[PDB]
Amino acid sequence: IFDYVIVGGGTAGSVLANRLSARPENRVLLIEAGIDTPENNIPPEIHDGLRPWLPRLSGDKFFWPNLTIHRAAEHPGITREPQFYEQGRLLGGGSSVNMVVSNRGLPRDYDEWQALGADGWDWQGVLPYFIKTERDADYGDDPLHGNAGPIPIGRVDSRHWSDFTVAATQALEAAGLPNIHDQNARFDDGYFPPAFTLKGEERFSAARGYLDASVRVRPNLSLWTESRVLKLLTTGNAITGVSVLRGRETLQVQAREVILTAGALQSPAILLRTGIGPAADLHALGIPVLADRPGVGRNLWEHSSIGVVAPLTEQARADASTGKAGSRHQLGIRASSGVDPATPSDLFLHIGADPVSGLASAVFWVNKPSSTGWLKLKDADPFSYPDVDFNLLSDPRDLGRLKAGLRLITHYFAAPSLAKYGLALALSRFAAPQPGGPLLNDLLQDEAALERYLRTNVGGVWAASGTARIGRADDSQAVVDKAGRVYGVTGLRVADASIMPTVPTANTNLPTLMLAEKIADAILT
Ligand SMILES: Cc1cc2nc3c(=O)[nH]c(=O)nc-3n(C[C@H](O)[C@H](O)[C@H](O)COP(=O)(O)OP(=O)(O)OC[C@H]3O[C@@H](n4cnc5c(N)ncnc54)[C@H](O)[C@@H]3O)c2cc1C
């Protein structure tokens, strides 16, 4: 019988399988639905870290195919449609298909988690785990940083910036923003070279860092790939195993503990199908109630995104080609919309230029939003995806933040070092930079068209989180305790981005690594 069965070998599941199997006495099985990515056969679309958008251009090969979501909140006069939402289906999960940035957020995010009932998940409580995961090439010997962890984190050198980047930084300085250098240990507003994870030009997923060739030969560690968990097995109020599809065979596997790391959209669907969820929703589908947990699938967080693109004028194109560090990430911007003063540093922006597509871009997102959504089962079948409603821009502050970021963009591009390029900025969906949207200067004058455009075209940043949140022992909307244990049953934990009480002011991979390290420590102690 396995001591731990870990469902989903993504970012979190990779950490948990490594840390829990480090004790020889723990017999650990990690199950992952997608392909393996062993060192001798990492697919090339995955392996190319300098082109980390590559997986998104190979259609659904590396993702949960036809996983569709509703994005923006329903609103009068707009007909929304289901949208494909990319989630990794392969060892390493999101870390195998992501944009390779590695950032922590801000102390306030985690102090918030503790204020909302996650005891010991304040900044002081999470920092050691941010330190444990990382090996920072630039600042690793400094306080607040790690120099020994499995996940490399580095930045491009300022001196290697393209003339286009330099020009954008001058525009930001004219707007009063300074270079803060280290977004992971300096927490006021400003711009910086983004921290990212790469091994030279190679992607370096959680699978490569936590499931390395030595880990894989641990005799107490079993790894099943192309293996899909269908259902949790139960005995009374204990979870006691899983049922697994491996090819055309179904297998039962006993476990002392099952840890769900199936991703923020799919972990809570497993919980619902197991009968852990809002009792009225479960009755509605004839699913026996094991525990009435009204928080399951609620509290769905995301980062709300939009793009701006312009054709590259000759000067801009030339300026864009002078960088000395290839197509790595060059520039990120942390800023305050001022919409709700209770939430500083609520915007993340990037300005860059791509000679290949021939476009300059200013993409950004609401990095600390106010809206949340939810997901529910469509039906009881184990193969169905959940019905997901991100409900973006349901809180009007988020709409105000989108408009403010667009005005910021206008301001930066009005500064001399950017205005000299003569770029004609137009709107675009965030993840599809392309022609077709209106001019930014024209749209901003038309309040009703602006709002309609934003509610129609708002996107996410793959930051799905919060659907099985940590919370206090007496809180009926909490799903798991401070160690990931699912309230109402035994033998079951959740330990992926589902457990975040709120989305951080951060892309979610590094906070996921951190939370997985913290949960693993809690289990082990
Ligand atoms: C396209 C994309 C770009 C991104 N860009 C970045 C970025 O640059 N930086 C950043 O910090 N974050 C970014 N993110 C987000 C970040 O990578 C995710 O938040 C993180 O991977 C979440 O980790 P996780 O363990 O919760 O889920 P995942 O890594 O998604 O892992 C869940 C795993 O569970 C498996 N699984 C699910 N159901 C079953 C089942 N029934 N049986 C067996 N296995 C199952 C999956 O196949 C998957 O491998 C991006 C994500 C995407 C998708």
Side-chain angles (χ1 to χ4, degrees):
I1 292 176
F2 292 97
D3 299 298
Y4 304 90
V5 171
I6 299 163
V7 182
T11 297
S14 295
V15 178
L16 281 153
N18 170 301
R19 290 309 186 195
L20 298 175
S21 65
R23 295 194 166 155
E25 75 197 76
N26 291 339
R27 196 155 104 91
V28 176
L29 174 61
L30 175 62
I31 309 183
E32 165 52 43
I35 59 165
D36 201 356
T37 64
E39 298 292 294
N40 73 2
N41 186 24
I42 295 165
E45 306 95 327
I46 298 304
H47 200 51
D48 177 355
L50 300 191
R51 307 185 176 74
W53 64 77
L54 218 26
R56 298 193 281 102
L57 271 30
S58 316
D60 61 27
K61 189 156 139 114
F62 308 111
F63 305 125
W64 287 81
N66 303 113
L67 174 43
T68 65
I69 62 77
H70 278 140
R71 187 93 72 172
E74 210 161 331
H75 202 261
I78 280 147
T79 297
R80 58 186 194 168
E81 313 151 325
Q83 297 176 22
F84 177 56
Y85 194 76
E86 294 93 348
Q87 296 285 89
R89 186 160 78 165
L90 69 175
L91 200 71
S95 69
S96 298
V97 298
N98 76 9
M99 294 292 281
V100 307
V101 299
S102 292
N103 56 74
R104 298 179 173 172
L106 302 172
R108 68 95 182 280
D109 292 326
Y110 302 100
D111 289 347
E112 176 186 57
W113 284 12
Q114 179 169 282
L116 297 176
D119 172 68
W121 291 82
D122 64 359
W123 177 242
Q124 166 168 197
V126 302
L127 177 59
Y129 300 97
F130 279 118
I131 289 162
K132 184 176 185 176
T133 190
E134 75 171 20
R135 179 166 40 238
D136 195 307
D138 308 306
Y139 310 105
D141 291 355
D142 304 338
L144 271 65
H145 286 293
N147 60 20
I151 300 299
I153 294 173
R155 296 151 196 83
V156 308
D157 198 309
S158 274
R159 301 181 292 245
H160 298 172
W161 274 337
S162 75
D163 285 337
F164 178 90
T165 300
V166 167
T169 64
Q170 290 167 353
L172 307 168
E173 299 255 10
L177 289 163
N179 185 345
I180 67 164
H181 304 105
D182 184 358
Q183 77 186 297
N184 293 338
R186 171 157 177 186
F187 302 124
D188 50 331
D189 283 347
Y191 68 86
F192 44 85
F196 55 81
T197 286
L198 288 177
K199 177 176 177 293
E201 304 192 335
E202 307 173 2
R203 180 183 296 277
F204 199 84
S205 76
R208 297 192 79 187
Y210 287 87
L211 302 170
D212 79 23
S214 66
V215 172
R216 289 168 171 252
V217 301
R218 281 170 182 176
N220 57 310
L221 177 56
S222 300
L223 194 235
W224 288 8
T225 51
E226 299 177 80
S227 294
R228 186 174 179 172
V229 167
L230 299 186
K231 291 196 279 212
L232 305 189
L233 303 177
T234 65
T235 311
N237 273 61
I239 282 63
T240 57
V242 292
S243 68
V244 190
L245 180 66
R246 315 189 68 181
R248 296 214 324 300
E249 191 179 0
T250 299
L251 300 187
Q252 318 299 311
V253 182
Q254 297 181 288
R256 293 184 173 99
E257 191 162 302
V258 175
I259 300 168
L260 299 183
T261 53
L265 301 182
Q266 304 202 269
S267 292
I270 295 166
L271 287 180
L272 304 166
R273 281 185 295 274
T274 307
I276 302 164
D281 292 356
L282 293 180
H283 290 150
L285 295 172
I287 299 169
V289 179
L290 195 63
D292 182 10
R293 312 301 311 165
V296 176
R298 309 297 299 176
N299 191 55
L300 175 55
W301 288 93
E302 174 61 274
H303 289 147
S304 296
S305 61
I306 201 62
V308 176
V309 303
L312 288 174
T313 53
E314 206 159 35
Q315 190 181 28
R317 183 216 106 255
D319 276 1
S321 326
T322 75
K324 302 92 198 182
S327 53
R328 299 174 172 74
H329 287 99
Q330 309 288 303
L331 187 53
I333 310 162
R334 177 193 290 154
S336 299
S337 74
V339 171
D340 179 351
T343 311
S345 307
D346 58 349
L347 297 179
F348 170 86
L349 312 95
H350 156 80
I351 300 173
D354 176 40
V356 174
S357 57
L359 300 169
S361 59
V363 293
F364 80 97
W365 55 88
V366 183
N367 217 192
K368 201 65 173 183
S370 299
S371 309
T372 56
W374 58 87
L375 66 83
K376 315 171 179 174
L377 300 180
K378 296 173 169 163
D379 50 58
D381 196 68
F383 292 89
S384 301
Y385 298 129
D387 168 20
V388 182
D389 192 340
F390 284 91
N391 203 30
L392 308 189
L393 298 187
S394 51
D395 188 295
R397 288 175 289 184
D398 293 345
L399 180 68
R401 288 174 173 114
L402 287 188
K403 305 185 215 182
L406 285 169
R407 305 216 157 83
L408 293 179
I409 284 173
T410 295
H411 184 65
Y412 304 151
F413 278 81
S417 59
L418 284 174
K420 60 178 202 247
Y421 296 129
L423 295 174
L425 302 172
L427 279 292
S428 175
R429 291 193 163 177
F430 166 80
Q434 67 142 356
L439 286 175
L440 176 60
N441 295 342
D442 295 353
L443 189 59
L444 288 170
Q445 305 199 5
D446 185 340
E447 296 275 14
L450 180 59
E451 171 170 347
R452 194 162 40 243
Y453 183 93
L454 291 169
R455 290 183 184 287
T456 299
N457 291 298
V458 65
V461 200
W462 308 284
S465 49
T467 46
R469 62 167 180 91
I470 304 162
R472 218 162 71 183
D474 64 341
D475 182 351
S476 57
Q477 302 299 134
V479 179
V480 309
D481 78 5
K482 79 176 75 175
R485 281 188 292 251
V486 176
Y487 299 117
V489 299
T490 61
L492 187 61
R493 294 202 201 234
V494 186
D496 63 14
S498 303
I499 75 169
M500 298 191 194
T502 57
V503 70
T505 310
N507 305 91
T508 46
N509 203 67
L510 182 59
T512 304
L513 291 161
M514 181 278 290
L515 73 86
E517 289 281 16
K518 193 166 158 69
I519 298 284
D521 199 33
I523 294 164
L524 285 170
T525 63

